[PDB]
């Protein structure tokens, strides 16, 4: 009969989870105490003894084969994969060497001090039974105070590897000792060790790849893949169990890590369902094992203790703490020299941040039960229970106090000001909406005292010298603007999460150190990982280019392509993100400070960084076309789909569409995105004719396309060639089809790329050229004579006229800076302003008889070229300019040498 015991264990777990939250110590200790109470009752009353004599003394097989795999698999599921793989080498070598040192030193201490007849293998059992740690309570404590999530990942990963190594060592030593009939020669022992080393994780990886490939073919089905994932985990556990008695847990851990790594092939709802399911199973097993071990230790272990044996555990705790501190203190300089060093605070937290959790108690129970009626099992269980019940309270309380007294639990001043601003805004909004609602003719009867009191809110957080402070405050303002620009870019969907995290980390580490802005050296190092051996592998196999090896070649090809493609995508993303952010800062910081040389320094730094990054990115695009084409196509499709989804949501919110149909369209869009995620890694570049067909003002009609193709000429130029200088008429119109081109002319300097037309302005107004063109590489260009351009534009007079298209494009491309300079308050992005200008339409002066009247319907009005006269104010207007909202009567003259153009933005 067991039912009452497990039911009571679940109830007590719920009670100790609910009622014991405000105390600093974890709930589990309370559970242990409860078990102790039951034990003494089980000693006296025979009925409680009869009801506990079934789970109290349970077979070692079920515990060692069930309670351990669940715990170790849970410790390897909630782990973030990318952060762990960032610093896997450091954490694994640290955990391995720490466990080795701890085991050997605990063994020699057991020989020296414990004055027993313990053998060598018993000493390593007693040493490696407490080296394993299960510090889920550390993560529970540092979920809020652990600002550096890298520290949380490190403290979880080191514990995970320590648990794995401790399980391996204990199992091999138990098999060598408690079943002495087995031979113990090295000849097959080395084979067994290498088998445990390699044959496990390889099998886990193979089955993980197989099951992910199988799951990648199921679309819109949240029921089959749950069953497939659970069966995939169980069968590998079974095979790993028959494989070796130890390799099962390692293979299961590798499977869990690989499943958690992939995200595209599994929908998020299934992922969170599996997370919750596994967490619930882990919690239930954890509660059961604490209560069972408490009952066992109180019932039998305590009656065979001695005063010296009671004194020994304090010395054991001091010894384990001092060796744990010494190993990390000694390895700190080596990891500093390698490049993955630490500091005072991280070393001190790691020194006092280890809690002996559930695995130690499980192994103590197993060895106590296998020992039988001997003093050795009682000593193991008593010592493990004492060490755990001591550390799980002392280290928790002192780690809380130490976090309080040191710099971890501090709040930055900008964060406090941001909280104050948000609280003020919320209070203002609540006040205005309450004031509005009190004026209603239907809700004037509610008792406003409790209505006001219940909805209140509160913040959870409650000269050379002048030049130095102003430059410091300007630097902090610039970094804050850069951070909010990155956040805005992320929200719009033009930038991936990982690139956002990298950029924010770079911004914070640049702001932390004195008077240093964002360094382009670290960024170019970040995307310089393209200079790596996988490319050498690809070159070797392409040079190479027994019967079944043929089909072996492309698949490897594919994964190699994949294995680099993401990397370039990431790099490219960062570059684009950075450059856009920089431009926005260069538009907003201008009117913030009024010290001339400070603006000069800021502008010089920003311009140099912009030019260097754009040059390096253009050269990288020149190096390889296919990956750039694939990344650009994926970005365009993602932006289009995101905007379409936003339009669906807005149209639903207006009530025009019911919720069923909006859900259907959203599901279709999500299916399109999922099919996008499975796109080929690289695509061959388009031919030049497609590039000619893809320009803005030669689309929608083949007549203009082949009319231009009738007389379009192709030219080629090499390095160091000057194509056009200043002080001359616009001979023709260029179009870059390959290479990279530098343009410089009178102060500003820029680098173009493929797909950008050169000198559109020079052919419309016949202005002299104002650009010097040089070539940084080989280049092919398309040349069209201006005479043919004018003949063609005089030939076509349809309503979608080519003249209108070019004037619209040049107007928007010359008017984005004008709006973004002065009218750009907080909350405006390049994308928003570009779309808002896109919604507008150009106006002609034929129907207006050279007279325009400014209404309040049109948002803004600008003049590109020409002169706009006034009558009541009589003011001259130059070109180009944004017309301020003062004059509402714009008259125009007629001039043969110039015809004015004007642009407006209207409402929807």
Which residues are known binding-site members for 3',5'-cyclic GMP? Answer: 759-761, 769-770
Question: Cα–chain-centroid distance for residue 246?
Answer: 34
- Three-state DSSP class for residue 891: strand
Are 170 and 255 in contact by the 8 Å Cβ rule? The answer is: no
Is 224 among the residues that bind ligand AJP (CB under 6 A)? no
Which of 770, 795, 760, 803 lies closest to 899, judged by CA?
Answer: 803
How far apart are alpha carbons 906 and 908 in whole angstroms? 7
Shortest gap between Cβ of 257 and ligand POV (angstroms)? 13
Which residue, 208 or 771, has its beta carbon nearer to ligand POV?
208
Cβ atoms within 10 Å, residue 89: 11
Is 23 among the residues that bind its own copies (CB under 8 A)? no
Candidate residues 33, 140, 197, 231; the one interacting with ligand AJP per rule CB under 6 A: 231
How far apart are alpha carbons 323 and 327 in whole angstroms? 6
Cite the DSSP H helix spans in 589-684: 596-623, 625-653, 659-677
* Longest pairwise C-alpha distance within the chain: 115
Shortest gap between Cβ of 233 and ligand POV (angstroms)? 5
Are 713 and 783 in contact by the 8 Å Cβ rule? The answer is: yes
Q: Which two tokens stand for residue 161?
A: 């590897």
Which of 69, 178, 62, 381 lies closest to 54, judged by CA?
Answer: 62
Candidate residues 4, 19, 37, 66; the one interacting with ligand POV per rule CB under 6 A: 66
Binding site for 3',5'-cyclic AMP, by residue number, is 759, 761-762, 769-770
Q: Which two tokens stand for residue 429?
A: 């909004």
Is 501 among the residues that bind its own copies (CB under 8 A)? no
How far apart are alpha carbons 578 and 584 in whole angstroms? 10
Contact set for its own copies, span 472-491 (CB under 8 A): 483-485, 487-488, 491
Candidate residues 202, 222, 230, 411; the one interacting with ligand AJP per rule CB under 6 A: 230
Shortest gap between Cβ of 284 and ligand AJP (angstroms)? 6
Is 764 among the residues that bind its own copies (CB under 8 A)? no
Q: Which stretch binds ligand POV (CB under 6 A): 66-74, 196-204, 598-606, 770-778?
A: 66-74
Is 812 among the residues that bind its own copies (CB under 8 A)? yes
Contact set for ligand POV, span 327-356 (CB under 6 A): none
Per partner kind, with CB cut-offs from 5 to 8 A, the member of ligand AJP, ligand POV, its own copies, none near residue 180 is none
Total binding residues toward ligand POV, as defined by CB under 6 A: 13
Is 413 among the residues that bind its own copies (CB under 8 A)? no
Q: Which stretch binds ligand POV (CB under 6 A): 211-219, 231-239, 552-560, 810-818?
A: 231-239
Candidate residues 336, 505, 608, 696; the one interacting with its own copies per rule CB under 8 A: 696
Shortest gap between Cβ of 2 and ligand POV (angstroms)? 11
Candidate residues 60, 685, 688, 880; the one interacting with its own copies per rule CB under 8 A: 685
Per partner kind, with CB cut-offs from 5 to 8 A, the member of its own copies, ligand POV, ligand AJP, none near residue 373 is none
Is 318 among the residues that bind ligand AJP (CB under 6 A)? no
Per partner kind, with CB cut-offs from 5 to 8 A, the member of its own copies, ligand POV, ligand AJP, none near residue 237 is ligand POV
How far apart are alpha carbons 388 and 32 in whole angstroms? 11
How far apart are alpha carbons 206 and 559 in whole angstroms? 15
676 φ/ψ angles, rounded to the nearest 5 degrees = -60, -40
Candidate residues 552, 656, 798, 846; the one interacting with its own copies per rule CB under 8 A: 656
Candidate residues 214, 234, 344, 535; the one interacting with ligand AJP per rule CB under 6 A: 234
* 171 secondary structure, DSSP code: H
Residues in the chain, total = 908
Candidate residues 186, 242, 413, 455; the one interacting with its own copies per rule CB under 8 A: 455
Contact set for ligand AJP, span 5-64 (CB under 6 A): 6-7, 10
Which of 277, 399, 380, 395 lies closest to 29, judged by CA?
Answer: 395
Are 769 and 759 in contact by the 8 Å Cβ rule? The answer is: yes
Instruction: Give the H/E segment covering residue 784.
Output: strand 779-785
Sequence-ordered list of residues with C-beta below 8 angstroms from that of 539, at least 6 positions apart, any chain: none
Which residue, 234 or 467, has its beta carbon nearer to ligand AJP?
234
Which residue, 236 or 606, has its beta carbon nearer to ligand AJP?
236
Is 62 among the residues that bind ligand POV (CB under 6 A)? yes
How far apart are alpha carbons 196 and 193 in whole angstroms? 5
Which of 708, 572, 673 lies closest to 632, judged by CA?
Answer: 572
How far apart are alpha carbons 354 and 320 in whole angstroms? 10
Shortest gap between Cβ of 390 and its own copies (angstroms)? 27
How far apart are alpha carbons 73 and 233 in whole angstroms? 10
Per partner kind, with CB cut-offs from 5 to 8 A, the member of ligand POV, its own copies, ligand AJP, none near residue 539 is none
Are 866 and 899 in contact by the 8 Å Cβ rule? The answer is: yes
Q: Which stretch binds its own copies (CB under 8 A): 66-74, 304-312, 466-474, 808-816?
A: 808-816
Shortest gap between Cβ of 11 and ligand AJP (angstroms)? 10
Per partner kind, with CB cut-offs from 5 to 8 A, the member of ligand POV, ligand AJP, its own copies, none near residue 2 is ligand AJP
Cβ atoms within 10 Å, residue 751: 17
Candidate residues 50, 279, 729, 749; the one interacting with its own copies per rule CB under 8 A: 279
Instruction: Give the H/E segment covering residue 702.
Output: helix 702-711
Q: Which stretch binds its own copies (CB under 8 A): 30-38, 441-449, 547-555, 594-602?
A: 441-449
Contact set for its own copies, span 876-895 (CB under 8 A): 885, 888
Q: Could you give the string, one character per residue 250-289, with x where binding to ligand AJP holds by CB under 6 A and - elsewhere?
A: ----------------------------------x-----
* 892 secondary structure, DSSP code: -
Q: Which two tokens stand for residue 583?
A: 């431009």
Candidate residues 6, 10, 25, 70; the one interacting with ligand POV per rule CB under 6 A: 70
Q: Are strands 772-775 and 732-738 parallel, antiparallel or unpaired?
A: unpaired
Shortest gap between Cβ of 377 and its own copies (angstroms)? 32
CA angle (114, 115, 121) in 5-degree steps: 70
Q: Are strands 749-751 and 713-717 parallel, antiparallel or unpaired?
A: unpaired
Contact set for its own copies, span 210-249 (CB under 8 A): 217-218, 221-224, 226-228, 231, 235, 238
Residue 733, strand partner residues:
784
Q: Which residues bind ligand POV (CB under 6 A)?
A: 59, 61-62, 65-66, 69-70, 73, 230, 233-234, 237, 252
Q: Which residues bind ligand AJP (CB under 6 A)?
A: 2-3, 6-7, 10, 230-231, 234, 284
């Amino acid at each position: 009969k067991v039912i009452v015991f497990i039911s009571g264990s679940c109830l007590f777990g719920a009670i100790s989870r609910s009622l014991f939250k405000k105390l600093p110590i974890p709930y589990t200790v309370v559970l242990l105490i409860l078990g102790a109470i039951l034990g003494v009752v089980a000693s006296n009353v025979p009925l409680v003894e009869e009801h506990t004599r079934d789970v109290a003394h349970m077979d070692p097989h079920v515990l060692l084969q069930i309670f351990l795999p669940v715990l170790i698999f849970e410790s390897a599921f909630a782990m973030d994969v990318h952060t762990f793989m960032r610093s896997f080498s450091q954490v694994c070598i640290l955990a391995l060497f720490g466990l080795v040192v701890a085991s050997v030193l605990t063994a020699v201490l057991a020989m020296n001090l414990f004055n027993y007849n313990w053998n060598f293998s018993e000493a390593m059992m007693f040493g490696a039974i407490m080296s394993a740690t299960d510090p889920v309570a550390v993560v529970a404590l540092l979920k809020d105070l652990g600002a550096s999530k890298q520290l949380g990942t490190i403290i979880e990963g080191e514990s995970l590897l320590n648990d794995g190594c401790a399980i391996v060592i204990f199992n091999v030593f138990m098999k060598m000792v408690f079943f002495p009939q087995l031979t113990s020669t090295v000849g097959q022992n080395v084979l067994y060790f290498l088998q445990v080393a390699v044959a496990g994780p390889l099998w886990g990886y193979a089955v993980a790849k197989v099951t992910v490939f199988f799951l990648s073919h199921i679309f819109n089905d949240a029921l089959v893949e749950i069953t497939i994932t659970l069966a995939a985990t169980y069968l590998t556990y079974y095979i790993g169990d028959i494989w070796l008695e130890v390799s099962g847990v390692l293979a299961v851990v590798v499977l869990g890590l690989i499943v958690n790594a992939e995200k595209t092939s599994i929908s998020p709802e299934v992922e969170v369902f599996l997370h919750r399911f596994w967490e619930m199973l882990a919690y239930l097993a954890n509660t059961l094992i604490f209560m069972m071990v408490g009952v066992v230790v109180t019932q039998k272990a305590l009656v065979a203790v001695d005063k010296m044996d009671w004194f020994y555990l304090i010395i054991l705790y001091l010894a384990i703490t001092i060796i744990r501190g010494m190993v990390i203190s000694l390895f700190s300089p080596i990891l500093s020299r390698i490049g993955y060093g630490l500091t005072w605070r991280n070393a001190v937290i790691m020194t006092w941040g280890g809690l002996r959790g559930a695995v130690g108690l499980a192994l103590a129970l197993v060895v106590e039960n296998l020992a039988g009626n001997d003093v050795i099992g009682s000593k193991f269980l008593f010592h493990t229970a004492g060490i755990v019940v001591l550390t799980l309270v002392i280290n928790a309380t002192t780690i809380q106090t130490l976090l309080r007294i040191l710099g971890m639990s501090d709040i930055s001043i900008p964060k406090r000001l941001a909280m104050a601003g948000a609280v003020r805004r919320i209070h203002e909004g609540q006040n205005r909406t309450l004031n509005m609602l009190k004026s209603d003719r239907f809700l004037a009867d509610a008792d406003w005292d409790i209505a006001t009191a219940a909805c209140e809110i509160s913040d959870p957080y409650s000269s050379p010298r002048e030049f130095a402070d102003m430059m410091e405050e300007a630097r902090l303002r610039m970094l804050k603007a850069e951070k909010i620009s990155y956040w805005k870019q992320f929200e719009h969907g033009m930038l991936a999460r990982e690139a956002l995290r990298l950029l924010v980390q770079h911004a914070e580490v640049a702001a932390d150190e004195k008077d240093q802005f964002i360094l382009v050296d670290d960024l170019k190092k970040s995307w310089q990982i393209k200079g790596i051996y996988p490319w050498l592998k690809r070159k070797l196999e392409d040079l190479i280019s027994l019967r079944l090896t043929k089909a072996l070649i492309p698949k490897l090809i594919l994964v190699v392509n994949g294995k680099i493609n993401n990397q370039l995508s990431l790099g490219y993303d960062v570059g684009k993100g950075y450059i856009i952010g920089e431009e926005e800062v260069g538009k907003i910081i201008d009117r913030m400070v009024d010290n001339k040389k400070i603006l000069r320094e800021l502008k010089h730094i920003s311009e140099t960084g912009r030019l260097q990054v754009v040059k390096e990115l253009g050269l990288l695009q020149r190096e390889h076309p296919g990956i750039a084409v694939s990344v650009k196509t994926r970005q365009a499709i993602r932006t289009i789909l995101n905007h379409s989804r936003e339009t669906i949501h807005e149209l639903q919110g207006a009530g025009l569409l019911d919720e069923m149909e909006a859900h259907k369209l959203e599901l279709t869009v999500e299916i399109k995105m999922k099919r996008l995620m499975n796109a080929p890694s690289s695509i061959p570049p388009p031919p030049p004719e497609n590039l000619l067909k893809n320009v803005s003002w030669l689309a929608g009609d083949m007549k203009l396309i082949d009319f231009i193709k009738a007389r379009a000429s192709l030219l080629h130029f090499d390095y160091g060639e000057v194509i056009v200088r200043e002080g001359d008429e616009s001979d023709g119109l260029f179009l870059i089809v390959s290479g990279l081109v530098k343009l410089y002319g009178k102060v500003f300097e820029d680098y173009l790329t493929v797909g950008n037309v050169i000198g559109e302005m020079g052919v419309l107004t016949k202005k002299p050229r104002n650009a010097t063109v040089t070539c940084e590489t080989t280049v092919q260009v398309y040349f069209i004579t201006a005479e043919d351009m004018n003949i063609a534009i005089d030939t076509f007079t349809l309503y979608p006229s080519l003249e209108y298209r070019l004037w619209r494009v040049v107007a928007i491309r010359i008017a984005t800076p004008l709006i973004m300079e002065q009218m750009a308050f907080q909350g405006w992005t390049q994308e928003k302003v570009k779309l808002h200008l896109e919604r507008g339409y150009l106006v002609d002066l034929a129907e207006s008889h050279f007279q325009f009247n400014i209404d309040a319907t049109l948002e803004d009005v600008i003049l590109i070229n020409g002169t706009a006269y006034n009558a009541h104010t009589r003011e001259e207007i130059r070109s180009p300019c944004l017309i301020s909202r003062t004059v509402h009567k714009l008259t125009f003259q007629y001039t043969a040498t110039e015809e004015p153009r004007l642009f407006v933005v209207r409402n929807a």
